[PDB]
Amino acid sequence: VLRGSRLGAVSYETDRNHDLAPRQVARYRTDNGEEFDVPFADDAEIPGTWLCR
Amino acid sequence: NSVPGAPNRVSFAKLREPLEVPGLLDVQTDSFEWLVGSDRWRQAAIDRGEENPVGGLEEVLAELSPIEDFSGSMSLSFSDPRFDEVKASVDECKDKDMTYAAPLFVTAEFINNNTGEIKSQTVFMGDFPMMTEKGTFIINGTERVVVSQLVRSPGVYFDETIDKSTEKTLHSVKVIPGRGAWLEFDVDKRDTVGVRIDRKRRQPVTVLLKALGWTNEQIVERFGFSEIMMGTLEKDTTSGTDEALLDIYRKLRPGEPPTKESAQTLLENLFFKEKRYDLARVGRYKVNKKLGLNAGKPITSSTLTEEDVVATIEYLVRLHEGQTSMTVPGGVEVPVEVDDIDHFGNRRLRTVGELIQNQIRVGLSRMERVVRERMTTQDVEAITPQTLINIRPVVAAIKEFFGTSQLSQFMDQNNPLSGLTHKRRLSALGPGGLSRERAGLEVRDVHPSHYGRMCPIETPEGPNIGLIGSLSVYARVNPFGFIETPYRKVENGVVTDQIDYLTADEEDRHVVAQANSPTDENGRFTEDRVMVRKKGGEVEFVSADQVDYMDVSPRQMVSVATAMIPFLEHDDANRALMGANMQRQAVPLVRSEAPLVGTGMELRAAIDAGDVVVADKTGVIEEVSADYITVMADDGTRQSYRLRKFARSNHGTCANQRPIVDAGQRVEAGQVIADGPCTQNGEMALGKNLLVAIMPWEGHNYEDAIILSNRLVEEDVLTSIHIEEHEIDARDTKLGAEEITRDIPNVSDEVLADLDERGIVRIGAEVRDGDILVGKVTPKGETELTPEERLLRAIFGEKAREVRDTSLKVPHGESGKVIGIRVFSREDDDELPAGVNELVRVYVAQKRKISDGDKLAGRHGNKGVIGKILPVEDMPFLPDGTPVDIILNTHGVPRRMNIGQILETHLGWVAKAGWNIDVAAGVPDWASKLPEELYSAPADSTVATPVFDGAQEGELAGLLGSTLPNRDGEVMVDADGKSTLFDGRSGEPFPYPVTVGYMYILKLHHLVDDKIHARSTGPYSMITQQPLGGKAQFGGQRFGEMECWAMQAYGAAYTLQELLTIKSDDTVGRVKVYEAIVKGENIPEPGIPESFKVLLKELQSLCLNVEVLS
Amino acid sequence: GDFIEDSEAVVAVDAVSFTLLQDQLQSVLETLSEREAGVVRLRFGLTDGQPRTLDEIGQVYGVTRERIRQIESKTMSKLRHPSRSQVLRDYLD
Amino acid sequence: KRLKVVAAFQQSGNSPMGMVLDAVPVIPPELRPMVQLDGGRFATSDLND
Amino acid sequence: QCGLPKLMALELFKPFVMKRLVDLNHAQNIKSAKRMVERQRPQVWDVLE
């Protein structure tokens, strides 16, 4: 009777891993000693600090 | 009879009616006139012997007045309500979507005592909706009916229950007000009396007694004869009046120790103050009648008192003690027994007036709170009443009632009878009453008091059985709200034509005889014993000497609809209910025709429904046209009546009126001058008379199915006009205002060929599903098209339209002719909702013919779906060549106990072909009881057979045996009602004669157009990814639990899996299955339904570690 | 919430239809010579999803941007001719 | 009566400290969505309150 | 055997009908077949049967 939508829209594209965006992973460590990984694109400019999980 | 324009319908009635059927809509109009205090009601009340009567609104205003601030330094008093002329006409209100209302004005006397000043001026209290003539309210364009509510009346109700724990008959009593808290008493199995206030924990009665100030001596003096109260007093530790308050107070205020003044005044405020407790003028009457207190004067008090509470307690004790008659000091003797809450002597009827009055009272209470709060913080001696009276809450309450209240229902305009029976409906549910899923069986079972007040036959067949009913034909509503019924007074064995209207409880003091009991020419009873009702509801024989009242007429117990069914005796109540209910579902046909065999009601029910047009004054018709009728009255005045043409009803049925008068014809006042939808010459016509043959036919009428002749399709015998409304609104958005235009993106030129310059579909154009009704577009904004779409749009170069199409289109499976358009624009200063700019409504009309699957029904509860429509030559035909229009199966009649349809079939043939009783050597014995008018009649002669005074079984045989010869000079139907039909396909005559006659059949509105559904793929719900259905196009069917059980029982695994995962919930699998079907590839395996994954996520969100492992 | 219709739903017929076009278009582009096809596939980014300016197509083709525009015009006129338009015209709606 | 629960915690190895929460999980947004109806009026589940 | 209404049958079998409409060259592609079925053009019934 009435209609609405989420805060976004859908995309019908299909392609898969055959296209690769060059990426590398940075490593971070927090105060309590936990460590985490974050994949960034090869454009890099990786930040010195990151908000982890 | 009084009605001037009645067609001459000969009647089989043998009993002379002493009372004329009252105004069937009086229950609404009289109540509303009481509410507004119209001068007619005021004069009538005086004619009834009343003195200084007060209207419903005057009562509310007087109750509100005087508004007194504490310390008594000033006061305010509302009074003198006045109504001005209604703002707009009913037709204009419907057309322009307004509310039919009149301004309300009152005077307000403001008194300043500290200076002695007095001021007053008229105050505008808002627009008050008004009941239009014929009893309906026009709210926001729609037409609404306020159904009366049947509710248990305030009063004292004693009850007794036997408990197997000790086999003792414990007793209890409840005092229920119209306002305030509750109070009840009970006797426990331990020989003690207890009190419960506001349903709190049980406490001894002596606590309450000593709270009022009673001591040991008074209790011993008055109640010393009863052991239970003495034992309770002995066990009770209370000593001193203040001690009872000490115990009572802390129960409601656990943390605050009591104080003498507040504790003592709490009881008086809780119960003995009219401010917070009210019997509402009816509980007072019932309590006075039951306990015998204060009888003989119109007590203005409505609050509880010391004497009545102790009287109720004493009554309970005596009832337990075993007394059968009781007396009270200063009162009158009364019998002792328990009270039946289902008796209409205890259940009253809130009419429309009281229902509106309650909400007016609530609104004025809020207004009073605001005024009393704000009068403390304004300049004294300079304030003005019009500057602090705030009318917003009362208007808000009135608007809420007519809009959201469960009683203010949509007018049921399926046909005149549906609307007529909806207006005088009684509902036991709604606020302040019961609910559908509660109350069990007791509230809804029939009761002996219903006779002549509420019809036992007519009632919904669904879960609302018994909770909804219809007021009797002769019943009227007492001013207090009880249902009265008329009876003839009989003195010492001779009747007397003085008719008294008795309420339910007063009838039990007399014995009432049947209406049909024979009497001598002088009025004396001719029999020695007569069959009568007794005080307990039993039916017994009694000597004629002992009778004191008599029924007005046999039709007293039936409602308006039930009175329509002929030969009601020969139909079982189970099928009579179905017959009464189906008549409310008949759709109006293109040309309606009155039934050959009917009841005398068919006339009045048509006139009182208000759908027909009647002359207001005696005169001569001066000018007649399809649109209006102009009549010149004998007094020199000229009246003009406008006939509504092809107006859409609430349910889509056409409501065309047509004139039945010729220029120069003289018409008496009240004469019908134009038929409504289902009427002919002023008589109601819900269906069609057609030739029926009762016999099985090749199995096409198997299992209640029906076979129709193709003639009914050729000659539009059962054709009906249907009208639908399609609405679209153009509003504004953040990206700009969406607009209505003829041109819309990417549509073929042919599609927009039938569109006006302004983008609306041209009037009179033929429309088919998917066609454009209103061209509309909305701003699109960001597109960022995909590379493939970019390349394609480069290939043709078409522009990327700044707007997207959202045009209104004809729904799937609809078609017709555009008969009208109504347009609202804010640029013309309309009343469009906030944020709306334009509104367009298009009316599409279609002309539905009878087709396979359409449900047909009769007046006796026999209905079925048309299984086959055969050509005329295939139908069985009479020896003279006339084909039978309809064929009904034989096996359905005898076992359903609705043999009345056969009687109707015979009498219909008797009516179609005239009859002439051979009165050559005196009247035949079987015809000795017939009136002289029925000895002969021509062909196509209508007859009337009242529901309980109609033709006997013996007269039908004679009438069948005395039917006139046909056109060619031979009789087609023998005395047994059977004819030698010829088989239309093989040509051979049927081996045995078949019953043939004329039956009245109705076209029910249960067309499956809104019940036929199909869905390959369609919309899906936002929250649950399953398909939606039942309220939109392409709805999905619900595969229930029992269907899953059947699937498992079959051993069917794959079908169930695909039903539960692919077809319903597997979001990823749906598109894969669709593309597999489209490309012709085999279906892939299902995935995990979204339901299970959501279940895991939900369990994890609740701190439960749930995982799947192998 | 049980009866809110989602406007941005995954319509099945469109979802498959697009793929068909993404195939059909390819079959049309594959009807050309690779010499012509590569320019269009790079111009509109079909090969990797990123549109390329006239100059950047010369990074593998070598010819100047104006010549790439002329080649694009030639291919663009060849495709729009009715011999190939009718193959996929009605996919626009 | 007590021994049933005590043994239930005594078995399976899992500690009983799970009855006290140092952190609580948050359900994904779309299971408690905020949706704008036709006309711009918003509807939201109770959970996100 | 059972008798199925013509229009209900068409709406229920829509995709199966469109496949045969496309490969019989009655419609140029799936979208065209979808629109043509939605219009109940005469060629539909021969394929639905």
Swiss-Prot record, chain A:
Keyword Transcription regulation recorded: yes
Stimuli inducing this protein: Constitutively expressed during growth, increases slightly in stationary phase (at protein level).
GO MF assignments: bacterial-type RNA polymerase core enzyme binding
UniProt entry keywords in alphabetical sequence: Antibiotic resistance, Transcription, Transcription regulation
GO BP: positive regulation of DNA-templated transcription; response to antibiotic
Keyword Transcription annotated: yes
Domain of life (superkingdom): Bacteria
Subunit and interaction comment: Monomer. Forms a complex with the RNAP catalytic core, specifically with the beta subunit (RpoB); its binding site may overlap with that of Rif. May bind free principal sigma factors.
Family to which the UniProt record says this protein belongs: Belongs to the RNA polymerase-binding protein RbpA family.
Function text: Binds to RNA polymerase (RNAP), probably stimulating transcriptions from principal, but not alternative sigma factor promoters. Partially restores transcription in the presence of rifampicin (Rif) in vitro; overexpression leads to an increase in the Rif tolerance in vivo, with smaller colonies. Seems to act by removing Rif from its binding site and preventing its further binding. No longer stimulates transcription in Rif-resistant RNA polymerase (with mutations in rpoB).
Protein name, as recorded: RNA polymerase-binding protein RbpA
Organism: Mycolicibacterium smegmatis (strain ATCC 700084 / mc(2)155) (Mycobacterium smegmatis)
Organism ancestry: Bacteria, Bacillati, Actinomycetota, Actinomycetes, Mycobacteriales
Residues of the full protein shown: 5 to 57 of 114
UniProtKB/Swiss-Prot annotation, chain B:
Keywords, alphabetical: Antibiotic resistance, DNA-directed RNA polymerase, Nucleotidyltransferase, Transcription, Transferase
EC numbers on record: 2.7.7.6
Effect of residue 409 to K/L: Rifampicin (Rif) resistant
GO cellular component: a single term: DNA-directed RNA polymerase complex
GO molecular function, one term: DNA binding
Misc. comment: Mutations in the RRDR sequence (residues 423-449) confer rifampicin (Rif) resistance. Rif blocks transcription initiation but not elongation.
Pfam families the UniProt entry points to: RNA_pol_Rpb2_1 (PF04563), RNA_pol_Rpb2_2 (PF04561), RNA_pol_Rpb2_3 (PF04565), RNA_pol_Rpb2_45 (PF10385), RNA_pol_Rpb2_6 (PF00562), RNA_pol_Rpb2_7 (PF04560)
Family: Belongs to the RNA polymerase beta chain family.
Biological process annotations from GO: DNA-templated transcription; response to antibiotic
GN (gene name): rpoB
Purpose: DNA-dependent RNA polymerase catalyzes the transcription of DNA into RNA using the four ribonucleoside triphosphates as substrates. This subunit often mutates to generate rifampicin (Rif) resistance. Interaction with RbpA partially restores Rif-inhibited transcription; once the subunit is Rif-resistant however RbpA no longer stimulates transcription.
Organism whose genome encodes this protein: Mycolicibacterium smegmatis (strain ATCC 700084 / mc(2)155) (Mycobacterium smegmatis)
Assembly and binders: The RNAP catalytic core consists of 2 alpha, 1 beta, 1 beta' and 1 omega subunit. When a sigma factor is associated with the core the holoenzyme is formed, which can initiate transcription. Interacts with RbpA, which partially restores Rif-inhibited transcription.
Catalytic activity: RNA(n) + a ribonucleoside 5'-triphosphate = RNA(n+1) + diphosphate
Nucleotidyltransferase is among the record's keywords: yes
Protein name: DNA-directed RNA polymerase subunit beta
Curated annotation (Swiss-Prot), chain D:
Disulphide bonds in the chain: none
Role this protein plays: DNA-dependent RNA polymerase catalyzes the transcription of DNA into RNA using the four ribonucleoside triphosphates as substrates.
UniProt similarity note: Belongs to the RNA polymerase beta' chain family.
Subunit structure: The RNAP catalytic core consists of 2 alpha, 1 beta, 1 beta' and 1 omega subunit. When a sigma factor is associated with the core the holoenzyme is formed, which can initiate transcription.
Protein name: DNA-directed RNA polymerase subunit beta'
Lineage: Bacteria, Bacillati, Actinomycetota, Actinomycetes, Mycobacteriales
